[PDB]
Amino acid sequence: DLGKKLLEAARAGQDDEVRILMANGADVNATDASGLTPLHLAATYGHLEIVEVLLKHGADVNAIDIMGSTPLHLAALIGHLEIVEVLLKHGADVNAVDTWGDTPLHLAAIMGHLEIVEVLLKHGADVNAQDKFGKTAFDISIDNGNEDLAEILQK
Amino acid sequence: MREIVHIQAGQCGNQIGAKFWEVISDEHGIDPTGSYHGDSDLQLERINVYYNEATGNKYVPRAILVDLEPGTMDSVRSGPFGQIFRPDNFVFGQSGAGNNWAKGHYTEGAELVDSVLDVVRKESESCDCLQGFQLTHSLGGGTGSGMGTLLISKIREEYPDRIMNTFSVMPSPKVSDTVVEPYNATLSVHQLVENTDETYCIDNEALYDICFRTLKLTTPTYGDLNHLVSATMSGVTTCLRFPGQLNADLRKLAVNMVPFPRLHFFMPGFAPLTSRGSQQYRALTVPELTQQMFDSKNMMAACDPRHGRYLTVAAIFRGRMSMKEVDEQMLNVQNKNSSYFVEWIPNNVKTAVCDIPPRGLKMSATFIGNSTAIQELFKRISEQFTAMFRRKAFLHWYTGEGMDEMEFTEAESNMNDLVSEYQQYQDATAD
Amino acid sequence: MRECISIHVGQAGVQIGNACWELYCLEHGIQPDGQMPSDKTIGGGDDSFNTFFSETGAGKHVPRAVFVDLEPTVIDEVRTGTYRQLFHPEQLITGKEDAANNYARGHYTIGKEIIDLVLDRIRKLADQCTGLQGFLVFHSFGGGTGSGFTSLLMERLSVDYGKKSKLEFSIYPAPQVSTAVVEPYNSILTTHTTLEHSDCAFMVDNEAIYDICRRNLDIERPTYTNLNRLISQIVSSITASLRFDGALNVDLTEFQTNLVPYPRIHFPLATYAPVISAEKAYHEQLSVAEITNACFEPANQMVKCDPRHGKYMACCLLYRGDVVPKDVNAAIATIKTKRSIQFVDWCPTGFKVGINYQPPTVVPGGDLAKVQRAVCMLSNTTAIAEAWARLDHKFDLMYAKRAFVHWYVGEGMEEGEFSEAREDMAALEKDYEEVGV
Numbered sequence A: 001d002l003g004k005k006l007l008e009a010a011r012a013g014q015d016d017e018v019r020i021l022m023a024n025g026a027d028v029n030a031t032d033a034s035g036l037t038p039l040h041l042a043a044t045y046g047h048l049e050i051v052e053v054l055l056k057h058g059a060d061v062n063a064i065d066i067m068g069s070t071p072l073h074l075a076a077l078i079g080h081l082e083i084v085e086v087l088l089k090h091g092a093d094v095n096a097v098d099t100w101g102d103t104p105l106h107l108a109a110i111m112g113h114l115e116i117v118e119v120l121l122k123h124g125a126d127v128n129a130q131d132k133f134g135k136t137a138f139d140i141s142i143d144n145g146n147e148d149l150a151e152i153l154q155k
Numbered sequence B: 001m002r003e004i005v006h007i008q009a010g011q012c013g014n015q016i017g018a019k020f021w022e023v024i025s026d027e028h029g030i031d032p033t034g035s036y037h038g039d040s041d042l043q044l045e046r047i048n049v050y051y052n053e054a055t056g057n058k059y060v061p062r063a064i065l066v067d068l069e070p071g072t073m074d075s076v077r078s079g080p081f082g083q084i085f086r087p088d089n090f091v092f093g094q095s096g097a098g099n100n101w102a103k104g105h106y107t108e109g110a111e112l113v114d115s116v117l118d119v120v121r122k123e124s125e126s127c128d129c130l131q132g133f134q135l136t137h138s139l140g141g142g143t144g145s146g147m148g149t150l151l152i153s154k155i156r157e158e159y160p161d162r163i164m165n166t167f168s169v170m171p172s173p174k175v176s177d178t179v180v181e182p183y184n185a186t187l188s189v190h191q192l193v194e195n196t197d198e199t200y201c202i203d204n205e206a207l208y209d210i211c212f213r214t215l216k217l218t219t220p221t222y223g224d225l226n227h228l229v230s231a232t233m234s235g236v237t238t239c240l241r242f243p244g245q246l247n248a249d250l251r252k253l254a255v256n257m258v259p260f261p262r263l264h265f266f267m268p269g270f271a272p273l274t275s276r277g278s279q280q281y282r283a284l285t286v287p288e289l290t291q292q293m294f295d296s297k298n299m300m301a302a303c304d305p306r307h308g309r310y311l312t313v314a315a316i317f318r319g320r321m322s323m324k325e326v327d328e329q330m331l332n333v334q335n336k337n338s339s340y341f342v343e344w345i346p347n348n349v350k351t352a353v354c355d356i357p358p359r360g361l362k363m364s365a366t367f368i369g370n371s372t373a374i375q376e377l378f379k380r381i382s383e384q385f386t387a388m389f390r391r392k393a394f395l396h397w398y399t400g401e402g403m404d405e406m407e408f409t410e411a412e413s414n415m416n417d418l419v420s421e422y423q424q425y426q427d428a429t430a431d
Numbered sequence C: 001m002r003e004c005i006s007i008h009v010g011q012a013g014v015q016i017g018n019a020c021w022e023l024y025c026l027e028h029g030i031q032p033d034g035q036m037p038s039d040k041t042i043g044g045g046d047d048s049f050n051t052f053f054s055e056t057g058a059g060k061h062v063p064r065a066v067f068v069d070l071e072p073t074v075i076d077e078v079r080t081g082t083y084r085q086l087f088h089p090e091q092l093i094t095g096k097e098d099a100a101n102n103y104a105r106g107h108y109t110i111g112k113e114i115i116d117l118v119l120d121r122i123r124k125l126a127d128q129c130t131g132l133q134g135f136l137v138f139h140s141f142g143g144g145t146g147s148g149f150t151s152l153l154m155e156r157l158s159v160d161y162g163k164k165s166k167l168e169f170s171i172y173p174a175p176q177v178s179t180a181v182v183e184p185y186n187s188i189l190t191t192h193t194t195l196e197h198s199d200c201a202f203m204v205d206n207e208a209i210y211d212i213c214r215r216n217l218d219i220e221r222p223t224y225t226n227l228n229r230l231i232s233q234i235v236s237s238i239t240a241s242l243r244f245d246g247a248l249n250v251d252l253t254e255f256q257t258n259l260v261p262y263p264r265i266h267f268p269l270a271t272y273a274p275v276i277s278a279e280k281a282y283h284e285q286l287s288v289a290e291i292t293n294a295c296f297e298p299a300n301q302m303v304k305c306d307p308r309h310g311k312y313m314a315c316c317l318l319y320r321g322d323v324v325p326k327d328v329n330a331a332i333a334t335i336k337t338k339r340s341i342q343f344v345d346w347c348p349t350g351f352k353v354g355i356n357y358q359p360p361t362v363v364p365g366g367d368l369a370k371v372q373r374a375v376c377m378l379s380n381t382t383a384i385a386e387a388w389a390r391l392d393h394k395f396d397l398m399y400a401k402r403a404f405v406h407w408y409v410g411e412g413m414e415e416g417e418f419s420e421a422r423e424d425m426a427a428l429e430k431d432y433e434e435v436g437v
């Protein structure tokens, strides 16, 4: 089964292995036990070239795992700015909500990735989106006293 | 209570540790070769607390230098006082821990820890009346945090009756946007609540904020941050290094500052704030020093003290000034801000005056607060930890070194219980 | 002549003891090396000053005193100071590590490592006495050694010297010069465990002494040196009757007879007058009537409280200097009538009077003017219960939250001891209430 090998190659950043596996019928949209796809894993571990490659070969840019995480959630959380822009350019839902009520904006704000916050805002991120506990991204900036983030959210 | 054994672990630990030794050596009139060049008897009265007396009237820091990364060993030697440290007291491994708390605590770091204990023993048995230990480290990395907390636990069981004290620097995405650092800091805070008596929380978030917004440094360097740290560490150890009667050793400081065993994380503050190119800073008055000292902008932890209550406070004024004036201003700030102190600990603010000021200053004031507002710092880290941990991001880096995943849940649970305990005493009344 | 041994425990007891023995030497004419030219019997004798000083064959007069501390810093100053030759060097006893402002360390852990050495050194002084009457014990309430080691010592002394009297001079804490937040704890703990082992205790309120230095002596920010010089002047007035000829309070037993009607309420109040600044060397001399009236002003008391709020059970007036007995009698009569002084119904409503016709000595370097007459009033009044109430309240505020309690349980103390000590204090407050209605 080439799907499990494609998952591993996407996580490990093996560009050539990804290309060979796809040419031999490997399921680009295969999932591991928790619903993570090769695109999820490449976005998590920062392999930009593999992200672009998968998107040109039928990867669902808005796939969700068991917890409702999209690839954009994970790229925003880990802080890969280049991958965030590639995903948005290929139709990623900027306001996707996971099972904790978080949007990519929530996660970029929490982790302090201010440049990613700006990009998400420029692409229509909803500042009124509340997580499961009622918090918007702006609420998180006030409750943490992060003045730099608070300024950005009122640009 | 005399000798203190100083340990610095990891990159941040050795960096601020070296800066500490540079700054207090200058205060005590000690040159990079170890020779006393000073002009005051006060400088030597308590020199034994931090330095050993060597062969030819030479003073050697009672310091132990540790890192899994060899490169920092050479960077220490390259420094101004790099040749004053005992060559026997460098304990350095082969390869760094790669920001992996598990490598520091369980694998690489555990291999090297017995080598460190031997050096600790050799310095300890050489002491006439050992007080305890101070350790400088970061919580965000792998060596300082992972190996540091392992070293603490080992020392604590060999010297269970001595005081364990740490200067622990908290991670901030504003200084290092490395996403596993909330993991490492949370795992370390869990160790520190159980295994240290006193911890100075030095918050990189606060250090950045001060440099950027108050000192107006557009792009702060580690040298800019560490300038604030060295000034703080000099201030909070003043009472240990010069003659005095209040908080004059590590244990008397502890019983004055720690009313509940787990609530031993201190918020330090400093006035005036300077920027390595401080021009001709004019002397501040005692009332100015006193206000600035309780000001959120002067705290080395990113918390608003007005959002909580002070359980205990120690203040140290340095320089030549009217003792009567200090009594009046300290009394006054306690009257003005009476709602920010708990009423069920009477007389919980203690004041020391020290005659010798720090370099380049005629007046300075140092603040040591045990404040329930510190929960803002732990809640910040806890939120970042939970965002990463809920998606199980990079967990295999840790479990791959043998860590159980339940260690992550137990650490998170402990930090949340710590936050609840601060909130409990913040809401208590005397009734 | 019956001997008295003085014991000085911890920093406060040692520093006050140093000030007291300096003043004693000046009053008796003893030089810093122990020589006393006006003493004709060389190598011995039965004079009144021998209650506090023994004699060697070479004419040296040596204090009957032990100094004990758990760290060496303070006692080292005695060993190298002006009176370095005066004391038995084996009666200066130091450990290495102090009690860290923790009663439990003084009483249980650190204190137990030196207690047997102290008792053996005390036995050596006791063996030189022909008729030891007992002990004067100087210590703070607030420190770990002063509180915790003192009560361990008092416990052992009751076993080894069961029939001997034990008197305390105790330093009661004040926030202006306090070194530790837990001082109310240490104060309650030592009071509870010493109460049955002490026959009479004179409390010195550091706040009262502090305010007298500010008001009467024009010292802007008093230090321990200023406080201790005034305290030693007052302690000297209290022990004068033991060291000189006289008819009042002539042995330790008489202190209890005159001042302590029931064993638990054994805390007399001391008042002293006049206190005049050395800057006023040409002050007009105050009369016997003026200094006697001053003894009933709260501002001159060693403990902050209001005796107008209480009832008297005993009152002794000890004069020093140019004092004609008839003038004391007339001054008493005016006070007995004019002022509002209420005794309990079951006590004789009289004043005991002793006069020593030598004026007080002043120490060179001191803050006090010379005076021709002075008075120290010792009274047992229910108003001193106010001092306990203030302490008990600060205790209750912290103990309700169990603040700092872990420091004590960590050093071999059971948490139940806090509750036992506090309930004994509540019973003490009721003891005063039931006498004064």
Ligand SMILES: Nc1nc2c(ncn2[C@@H]2O[C@H](COP(=O)(O)OP(=O)(O)OP(=O)(O)O)[C@@H](O)[C@H]2O)c(=O)[nH]1
Pocket (backbone or CB within 6 Å): C009, C010, C011, C012, C013, C015, C016, C069, C070, C098, C099, C100, C101, C102, C140, C141, C142, C143, C144, C145, C146, C147, C171, C172, C173, C174, C177, C178, C179, C183, C206, C224, C227, C228, C231
């Ligand atoms: N009047 C007076 N009070 C003193 C003096 N020294 C200390 N104190 C008071 O005594 C209390 C502290 O107790 P200390 O005597 O210093 O402590 P210690 O007995 O040496 O015990 P540890 O140091 O804890 O082992 C505080 O309330 C001080 O204000 C002094 O020289 N004179």
Ligand SMILES: Nc1nc2c(ncn2[C@@H]2O[C@H](COP(=O)(O)OP(=O)(O)O)[C@@H](O)[C@H]2O)c(=O)[nH]1
Pocket (backbone or CB within 6 Å): B009, B010, B011, B012, B013, B015, B016, B097, B098, B099, B138, B139, B140, B141, B142, B143, B144, B145, B169, B170, B171, B172, B175, B176, B181, B204, B207, B222, B225, B226, B229
């Ligand atoms: N304030 C300050 N923080 C530092 C310094 N060096 C590293 N850090 C911080 O420490 C964390 C990384 O830990 P580090 O000490 O470099 O890793 P270690 O060598 O494994 O202990 C990051 O949060 C850095 O921002 C320094 O010199 N000053």
Ligand SMILES: [Ca+2]
Pocket (backbone or CB within 6 Å): C039, C040, C041, C042, C043, C044, C045, C046, C055
């Ligand atoms: Ca004789």
Ligand SMILES: [Mg+2]
Pocket (backbone or CB within 6 Å): C010, C011, C071, C098, C143, C145
């Ligand atoms: Mg002491």
